[PDB]
Amino acid sequence: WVQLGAQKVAISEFSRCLELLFRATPEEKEQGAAFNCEQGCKSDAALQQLRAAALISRGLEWVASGQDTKALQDFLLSVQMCPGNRDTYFHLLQTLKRLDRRDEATALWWRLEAQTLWSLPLYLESYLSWIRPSDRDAFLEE
């Protein structure tokens, strides 16, 4: 719906994704009820990175509408979620550099340099590589 141009039904679907990430658990293997996906769907990796994905996906639609406080909320959450993406920190820091750069930005700079792919499913790896900006490291060393 982003490619088609429909802000409404876009933010709809990002919100619906997020509700089934938090107001459900994917790891309820209490009851062996069927045949089921062992690997690709349970990985704590696939959870934290899928959260980050839809949070940034939605943050960009908030940026498009000019509600950059809501965008800041979703980006700040994805930072707490998966601190080893840097796509998250990139979008957050670009927003802080638009509005209120210094103290916030530097506080996250030092975090990144303090911080410094195991078995991610393919459609998700592929999706991240799709959305991520080329001018990433250039911005992060500024």
Binding site: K8, I11, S12, S15, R16, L18, E19, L21, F22, R23, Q73, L77
Partner: protein, 340 residues
Amino acid sequence: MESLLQHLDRFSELLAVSSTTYVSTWDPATVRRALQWARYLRHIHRRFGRHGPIRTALERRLHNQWRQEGGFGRGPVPGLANFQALGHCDVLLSLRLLENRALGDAARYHLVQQLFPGPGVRDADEETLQESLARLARRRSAVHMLRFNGYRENPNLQEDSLMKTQAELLLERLQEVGKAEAERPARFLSSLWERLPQNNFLKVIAVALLQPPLSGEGSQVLVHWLLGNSEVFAAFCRALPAGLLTLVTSRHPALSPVYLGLLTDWGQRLHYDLQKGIWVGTESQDVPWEELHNRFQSLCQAPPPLKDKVLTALETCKAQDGDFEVPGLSIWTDLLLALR
């Protein structure tokens, strides 16, 4: 007629100074004079108490005395409250002179034997002072015993005894000042609000707006007072339970659009966290999702002349804040959904 003025003001002076601690000189003469003046007043109450201009003239004297005193500065004196307090003015004085510690010994002896002559006058057509005190003491006990044995704080404050009562005390006192027209009731109510315990007061006013008329001037004064002071109405609407204020609305359409205004603005100053799927406020004093849900809950389970109002005030605030059809997004979408 004009003869009664100098009598009643002198007795009012003596009544106010009844409570006051100067009593060394006083004697049997003072006491006997007091009680016979009070009998004269109580006798007038019987004789030409109803359907007279002297009646209305004495109430002018009362209210203008009770407003020049005010309840401010020199003495917050209760005073004899109304023309019906004429009928037991003796009782007021007598009760207060027991309470006066400085009462000298032989005067107190003559006093108590003049009030309590004994069963020597067991036969009386006239309800004498001994029998009057009787019925008081009995009732007083009576009220202790009921309160502590079978009284319950009704949920529906409108039907509580004490709320119902305190309401009707307030409304007598408002009707007097309304007819008097000396000061505006606004001033009176504002001063009340500042002086006494607010939590009690609000609840009462609440209950007063709901009692049917008795002589709706009372309710029609208090609504204009409240619309006059928004800041008290912000703590009013905040402090009570839901059904109370809801039936307030179906009675007074004049409070509906402002009340929905209050919460409408209380809704917008939250934020939704995705970790706990719940709206929450930033500060300690911001209304919960549950109390807000509650109040709109009650307003929906109401008559049709408020249902459409609240429904449309929410639909117009939904459209204003993006016409989303999912939670996470609009406080107002959350509500509309939560209702089914």
